[PDB]
């Protein structure tokens, strides 16, 4: 197990494709090393900024972690796309899926007010994203009001 | 009595005790403090290399 771990650490340090990172996560999951999976994801989002990587991390924390971590990883995702918006790394569809996922997760946790604040502040930050407005429409049609 | 206890505590604080005062926990304490970004939360590249590359400008050349 320790040799396999050192092998994955070297491989990932050489900046390989997403397949190697996914395999390393699967390895630590086999080891039930949840802190190792957090550390790998902490590196993986830097090596592969695509929004599916962040959503893989939040998907992990939902099944193998506490809600404090899940909120903190979503907050890292938004703070990251907000600070790095000037690079245009993510497409609008990616940021939209991140915000919608975060809003629906806060809606599941019965904190509809914090999802509403999330949608308002995110729309204020990125007014050019139509997909984000449509996501607010989808949310408001089932959790909002008629007016 | 409680106001007196608070007074005694504040005195002991002033006269002695005052002289002695993972990614997600770091992120939470950074969030508390907030009441480039990557280099403060992450601790070593890709995003740094890309932003550093985008900041510069290639020299202009006339078309052939």
């Amino acid at each position: 197990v320790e040799i396999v771990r050192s092998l994955y650490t070297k491989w990932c340090s050489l900046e390989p494709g997403v397949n190697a990172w996914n395999s390393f996560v699967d390895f630590e999951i086999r080891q039930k090393n949840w802190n190792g999976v957090r550390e790998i994801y902490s590196k993986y989002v830097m090596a592969h900024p695509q929004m599916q990587t962040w959503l893989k991390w939040v998907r992990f924390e939902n099944r193998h972690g506490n809600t404090e971590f899940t909120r903190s990883v979503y907050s890292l995702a938004i703070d990251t796309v907000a600070n790095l918006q000037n690079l245009q790394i993510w497409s609008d569809m990616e940021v939209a899926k991140l915000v919608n996922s975060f809003a629906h997760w806060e809606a599941a946790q019965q904190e509809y007010e914090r999802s509403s604040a999330l949608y308002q502040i995110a729309i204020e930050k990125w007014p050019s994203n139509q997909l984000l407005k449509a996501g607010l429409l989808d949310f408001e049609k089932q959790f909002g009001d008629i007016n | 009595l409680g106001d007196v206890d608070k007074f005694y505590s504040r005195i002991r604080w002033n006269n002695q005790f005052s002289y002695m005062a993972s990614l997600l926990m770091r992120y939470d304490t950074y969030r508390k403090e907030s009441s480039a970004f990557v280099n403060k939360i992450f601790q070593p590249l890709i995003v740094n290399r890309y932003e550093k590359l985008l900041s510069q400008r290639p020299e202009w050349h006339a078309p052939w």
């Binding site: 070297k10 340090s13 900046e15 | 290399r49 550093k52 510069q56 290639p58 020299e59």
Partner: peptide
Amino acid sequence: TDQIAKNVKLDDFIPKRQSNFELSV
């Protein structure tokens, strides 16, 4: 340990001039 693929280093793949175009050669 650092015995695995000792000769392979990330810095060998990174172009040195991307961080500073005006680097002197």
